[model samples]
Target: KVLNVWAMGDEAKSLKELAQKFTKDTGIEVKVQVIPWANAHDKLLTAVASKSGPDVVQMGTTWMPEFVEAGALLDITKDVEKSKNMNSDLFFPGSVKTTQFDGKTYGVPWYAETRVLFYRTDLLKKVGYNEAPKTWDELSDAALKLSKRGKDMYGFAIDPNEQTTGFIFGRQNGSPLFDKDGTPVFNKKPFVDTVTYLDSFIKNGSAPDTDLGLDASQSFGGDGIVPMFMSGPWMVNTLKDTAPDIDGKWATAVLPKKENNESSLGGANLSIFKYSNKKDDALKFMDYMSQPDVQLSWLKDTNSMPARMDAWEDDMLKNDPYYKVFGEQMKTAEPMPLIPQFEEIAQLYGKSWEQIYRGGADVQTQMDTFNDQVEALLKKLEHHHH
Candidate 1:
């Protein structure tokens, strides 16, 4: 059998190579088309609009809800259950649930992400501290010490333009990105507290107004621009390559909890197009990728945390201490958004985010309208649409 596959950028590229191994094992022919990430969204949307898409598609967890709601995906719950090693319990339940619409599964999880605190361990010690703080208030004091002692450095750095920072702050305050169903829920107390925490960076001279044109996480690496930063394993390679001087200066730990610790369950999932001619074939391919050996290769190739919890037993994560903190964060991790309208609302909220940070709009006032706009958008699309 042949698989007409479409994917975006590196994810598609990686899956294409992985598909070859599957073809060798199952005599399945995969026609893999790798599109650049910049155009991938448009390409997929256009294909979907014109009644053309691939047998299987790789998507960020956040993207599934909208696509599924559009009737662009197939439910593979029964097919997924048949895969011996790809049980629902085998992968992180949070990541798996993102692709679920109503009560059926439309996708399989491939990888996930979450942020952790990367601090100036050496500077932290120089300021008379031996470990990362475990609470919000403790961290502020720690940042105060690190900022004053370092040369033109601050306690933290986050690119003001990115939406992840907002999500992190909200999670810190024990809030959900969306409320019970598909409504924007950021104007509440959780959002207020989250913004308050971020405000500390700017109010205390910890974060500077350097982004008149550029974007940088204000608190990380050796530029002393940001003595600390919140990041994941990817940053380890970045810091080593970009700021070699801080080779041993920094270390990573979980962010201190608000009233409770929490994190956005971060990762991507694989789904099949409902309009595809080969739904069963796509599910078969997903099963191949979720195998333990395949998941381990995925981890090695992409440097992403495998959604498969059992992969944790590998020394790559278990023996290393950084992932342990991430593991703890994952325990508190929850799905970001699953509604089809969530994608647009997330951005709308993001554009409004700057307004909140600058105090241009009241969080409550903006949230009230945000929900109205979301409900209106969802109404335009009916489940009957292709």
Candidate 2:
């Protein structure tokens, strides 16, 4: 059987180039159809319902839960364990966890992205710290010192709109968004403590009461307003494009440690279709793409952080200071909830944080109210899935 694969965006086109090498080496004629992302979900579903979809497909990690629920993905645990090259231990645990639903692996991580601490090296230096802070107390202490350097300069910029930031702090404080038994404990003490932690920054006048009023590029790079912030890899290119003049002014680090340094993972996965007959060839193709050399090429071409740890060893990744920070930090990154109903919960989760910071509501009261609402929604998600 001929092995066919479908991928979307520029990634799909780049994959076609990689597929040709697979054909030449293994003598397997691989078909790579580049699908436009605009209507890809609709088209993929149509093909799957007709039993005519490609053998393998590119899936966003969050999409895995929905596709698994629909029975469109093949369980590749046996194949993953059997193949020497496809060992799960070789990848980042958080990235690997995303490809699993209910404890069975279904996809191989293709690439990943995470938020890192973006800070002004000069600002930290003035504060008597040559490096970024490593703990909550250290961050607070440094923030206070750094803010005192200038009247208008603030130590940090907090993004109220980014739910991933909330989720990261929640996870760091030992508040699981959901219990293993499926209870939503978002209103628990750890989450409340995280809110109080952020409140401390504002109360101490170390951080502005509002979000960075200006765009991050202008604020962080040239303007030198907020000394620190948290964001993903996309900011690297953005900062280069918007404020190239400030090239060496800033540095990246893992998020300031709470209990321990942690972050949120976002990116895509490579999955095989259950209905395809070419399972062996499909798995072989995935293994080929998983090779460190191939992963490096993908990273260079796409500018995505590779999911495999071995890929980081290449001098190109090792020598680059920005990539080096992200690579190390991704080791402990965790994905947001992968369940299909997570979006609903996330909106409510986000709104609770907004009320705390923006609306000036009592943090405890807002969280207590949100806790009741989240528990109700969790029940619905559990019932819907069961």
Candidate 3:
């Protein structure tokens, strides 16, 4: 018996080798097909819309919600509950939750990315700090202190266009932006305080008014224009390749906390299609991949962070002081809302922040305005999806 698998992009190349191990151990032949990411969405949707696709497939974490909504993915909740290697507790809580919707699990987290604070060590020390801040107040203080250095040099970059700003801060304050019924709670006290906190940086001249096209490599390394920003591990190579001259000048840390520091989840999940001819064998493949050691190997090979929480304790991850803050931050990270209409909601959120930070709209008034509109939109999507 053979299991048909679909994986995408560069990672597809690596999985072919891994799948060979699965085939050797299980005596089940596995056929691996690589789909270019550029065509993954259309190809999968078309294949599954016709009630056909690979038995096992890789899904971008965000893409899982849409596939689940289409009724194309197998519900792995029971499979997960029964499996020792693939339980919710095995992976980062945020990553494990990404493939779930309406209380049913749909996919297993394969790898993940969570943002962390990256700053220039020399610049931070110039402002009389040897370490990154651990709270909003301290971070803001550092931002203001750093801005006093010179002309055209800012302390932080405020990118209102980044879609996850609300989610990140709301989660830090222990606020969830939506309820089970899909109601918008963005105007609630926790989110209100979170938005206000971020808005303060721009208004207080501690951060740039607009981060429209700010390039971090140039800003931090080339010109020392902005000393600090938050992003994922992929930027490690980006900074290295883009600005090799800044070697030994930078480092990373967890984001500053409120109730707790929280970051947004990015990356992919592994799932079985409901229409697969080899559902049982496909799940075995997922379980094989989910093993902590297997996940660690994936991390080393791809430079993608492992989804398994235990894998975070691996010496390879723990020894890299700069890169390891992401593993620490993953303990408190949260996924974006899994609602099918979440992209629409996120676009509205970006507009709300742009208006407040760029167009000078009052924070309270603007969130209230967007909250009412977003609530109505969520209700409509809920109704439509029903």
Candidate 4:
């Protein structure tokens, strides 16, 4: 019998090659369908409504909660427990968290991504720091030293409209983002501390109140107006292609710690559809993909970081200085709250942050209002799910 799989973007091409190998090994033919990201959500919704879809699907990490809430994915907890290579313990803690909702697992992390500090090596050295700052106080001190407001040069590039920064900072300071019952807790003390900490950069002129329409790749290299920024693995290649002149002048490091060095986790997961008749075969495919050797191959083919922690120990990753930082960062990185309303909540948080960071609004007032709005939105979403 043939099994059908759905993958997004360029990943489908690489998956096809692996699928052919699986076919030869198991004598079960597999067919892969490519779904563009723009159309994927709608397509998935239709599949859920129609009660028909591919045996396996590549699901965005953030999309896990939405699909699980929609009752579209199989609860593979038992299967995951039974499989040695594909169990939750084998993957990064942050990546594993995304597949879990309401105490059940719906998928296996296929790849992982997290933010880390990307800094100008020369600039930091000039500030009397030869390495990336490892503590919040040290980071701020370096930032203040490197900044020259009159020259329009800032030490760090921070986006006021990006909510992930707040989330990462909040998490690092021990804020869970949501309560045990899934209520938003943005108005709490930890998050307030996080906001105040981020604002210090703006107040001290180490970072501009606004991003100033500066592309991070451009601002980070060359003249080094912005010597430091936080970004994902993709930026490594981006800086190489877009800012080749600063090749050896830059380096990446795990985020500086407030309480701990934690960043936001992002990536895709592989899920079997509830409606799929070929459930066993689909799980076998997932098990095959989860093998550490296979994960390494996937990394080489797709340039996506492996979700499995063991894959990071391979010489290809452990020997690379930049990737080693990411591996360390992934150990503590965390997933966003698992709620379908998170996208809307993130936008609201960003909007409120813009007002506070750029318009000189009070932090507590904005957070309180933003908290109420998010609480109301979560209430409405919960009602809709009923």
Best of the two (2, 4) by lDDT:
4
Model 4 C-alpha lDDT per residue in residues 1-386, reported as the tens digit of each score: 67989999844788999999989998888999999999888898899999998999999998888889888899999999989778999999989999988799999998999999999999999889989999889889989888963478888767766657888888888888888887778898999878888888988889877546667566887778888889888888778888888989999999998888889899999999989999999999998899888899988887789998889889989998778888888898888776677778889988888888778888888899999999888766753251
Give per-model TM-scores: 0.86, 0.89, 0.90, 0.94
**What lDDT is obtained when candidate 1 is compared to the true structure?**
0.70
List all candidate RMSDs to the true structure: 3.4, 2.8, 2.6, 2.0
Worst 10 residues of 4 by lDDT: 377-386
Cα lDDT tens digits, model 1, 1-386, are 57987666754567678889889988888888877778766677776788877888778777676677666677788878888766788887687778677788888887878778877777777667788777777778777766685556666665665556777668667777567765556667787667667667667866653453322333354445566667766776666667667777777788777766665676778788778888767777888877777887987777777787887778877777666667666655677655555556566666665665565566567666655665666678643233
- TM-score-based ranking, best first? 4, 3, 2, 1
Model 4 score (lDDT): 0.86
- Write model 2 residue lDDT over 1-386, tens digit each, in one string: 67989887744667778889889999988998878887676776776678778998988776777778877889999889887557788789989988887889998988899999988887788888889988888888888887786777778866766767777888888888788887777667998888888877777777777655687776787657788888888787777778776788888988888776789998888889889899989999999988889999988776888898899899888998888899888988899988876656777877887787668788889888888988787666652242
Q: Give the top-scoring candidate (TM-score).
A: 4
Q: What is the lDDT of candidate 2?
A: 0.82
Model 2 steric clash total: 0
Residue-level lDDT of model 3, residues 1-386, one tens digit each, is 67989888855767888888888999878999989999887888887779988898889887777788777789889988999788888888889888778898988888999888888888888887888888888889989888777766678766666777678878888777877676788888888888888888888887888653657677878657888888888888788888887899898889988888878987888899888878889889999999988998887677888987777778888888766888888887778876667777888988998888889888888889889988788656653142
Give the lowest summed-lDDT range of ten residues in model 2.
Answer: 377-386
Displacement of the residue 381 alpha carbon in candidate 3, Å: 2.1
